[PDB]
Design a protein around this ligand. Structure first.
Ligand SMILES: O=P(O)(O)CP(=O)(O)O[C@H]1[C@H](OP(=O)(O)O)[C@@H](OP(=O)(O)O)[C@@H](OP(=O)(O)O)[C@@H](OP(=O)(O)O)[C@@H]1OP(=O)(O)O
Ligand SMILES: Nc1ncnc2c1ncn2[C@@H]1O[C@H](COP(=O)(O)OP(=O)(O)NP(=O)(O)O)[C@@H](O)[C@H]1O
Ligand SMILES: [Mg+2]
Ligand SMILES: [Mg+2]
Ligand SMILES: [Mg+2]
Ligand SMILES: [Mg+2]
Ligand SMILES: [Mg+2]
Length: 317
């Protein structure tokens, strides 16, 4: 039996999408799934972690990525989502740089770094209705993102002609994903990316890859609108159907490969007749789609079989 090991925090390992997909992967005749216990991940040294032939492992808040890398280095499994890239995925500047090297359209942007110790003369000039970041001008509306991709306190600043102030986004709290603030001045402590605001129809497109030739997409109301979350009779956020065009399927192919994340979530903004990547999240499952569960488990099982059946002397086509 080929062992597929699952190494992530329990909140992810025991999530509904994860349990659904793992159940289906276990249906493969020659595959056994082993889920690493959170307590083992945190408290046991890597030498005591279970063995596996294929490792599916991914960082989220509180995950010891250092240990996961050390484990992979030690046991040399077939890695589905590259671990070293997950350091870069935590930094929006690194994400953006990769996207650019790959010829992927993204919002025009500029980085404002503040070395905390440095004599605080930032490369930032602020006007009533714009900012200048290292000489580059962003007219309101513009977007201000913390350089940490884990920091969801993304602000949007409105022009005086729309009444000024700002929209402060955050990781969803029940009925709400953003709130309006009368504050018009940018944040003065921290490092940020400033980007041009891309006009969409009011929805974000969320893309989920399973290898570079499979991508499920769906749309949700942008948090940058008013911030009221739309929920269904079951208390789950309303999603809208999406089919990616040829250019977008290519974007998904590139993102998956460039970031070496077989399973990869990213967001697209459909604006000005094009599609812009504004965020690459790394490992993420589609939630509450049974067809996704079927597809994703079959693809991953097939990836595992194709890669490992030969050395295990197992018949595979
Ligand atoms: O309890 P609620 O409000 O009904 C759902 P949440 O905001 O608590 O979960 C989100 C989760 O948020 P949370 O941390 O609150 O579980 C976050 O995780 P985080 O990035 O670690 O915060 C992501 O989970 P993944 O790790 O699966 O990507 C999100 O997945 P997407 O990016 O939207 O696909 C989840 O959003 P979902 O799609 O479930 O609404
Ligand atoms: N350049 C932009 N133009 C217009 N809207 C934007 C832009 N960047 C971000 N937004 C909106 O702000 C939301 C949050 O931005 P994003 O870069 O996805 O932050 P995040 O904190 O990484 N979110 P998550 O998907 O949970 O990781 C997006 O889904 C868009 O609706
Ligand atoms: Mg099995
Ligand atoms: Mg994540
Ligand atoms: Mg939550
Ligand atoms: Mg996003
Ligand atoms: Mg993100």
């Amino acid at each position: 039996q080929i062992v597929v090991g699952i190494c992530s925090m329990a909140k992810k390992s025991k999530s509904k999408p994860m349990k659904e997909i793992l159940e289906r992967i276990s249906l493969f005749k020659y595959i056994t799934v082993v889920v690493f216990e959170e307590e083992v991940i945190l408290n046991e040294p890597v030498e005591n972690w279970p063995l596996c032939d294929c490792l599916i492992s991914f960082h989220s808040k509180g995950f010891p990525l250092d240990k996961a890398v050390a484990y992979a280095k030690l046991r040399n499994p077939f890695v589905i989502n590259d671990l070293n890239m997950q350091y870069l995925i935590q930094d929006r500047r690194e994400v953006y740089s990769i996207l650019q090297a790959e010829g992927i359209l993204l919002p025009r942007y500029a980085i404002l770094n503040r070395d905390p110790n440095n004599p605080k003369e930032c490369n930032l000039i602020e006007g009533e209705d714009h900012v200048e970041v290292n000489g580059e001008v962003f007219q309101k509306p513009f977007v201000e993102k913390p350089v940490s991709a884990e920091d969801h306190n993304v602000y949007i600043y409105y022009p005086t002609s729309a009444g000024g102030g700002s929209q402060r986004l955050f990781r969803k709290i029940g009925s709400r994903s953003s709130v309006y603030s009368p504050e018009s001045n940018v944040r003065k402590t921290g490092s940020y990316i400033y980007e041009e605001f891309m006009p969409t129809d009011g929805t974000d497109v969320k893309v989920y890859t399973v290898g570079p030739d499979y991508a499920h997409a769906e749309a949700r109301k942008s948090p940058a609108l008013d911030g009221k979350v739309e929920r269904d009779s079951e208390g789950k956020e309303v999603r809208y159907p999406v089919i990616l065009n040829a250019r977008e399927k290519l974007i998904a192919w590139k993102v998956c490969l460039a970031f070496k994340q077989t399973v990869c979530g990213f967001d697209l903004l459909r604006a000005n007749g094009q599609s812009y990547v504004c965020d690459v999240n790394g490992f993420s499952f589609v939630k509450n789609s049974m067809k996704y569960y079927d597809d994703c488990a079959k693809i991953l099982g097939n990836i595992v079989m194709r890669e490992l059946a030969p050395q295990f002397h197992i018949p595979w086509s």
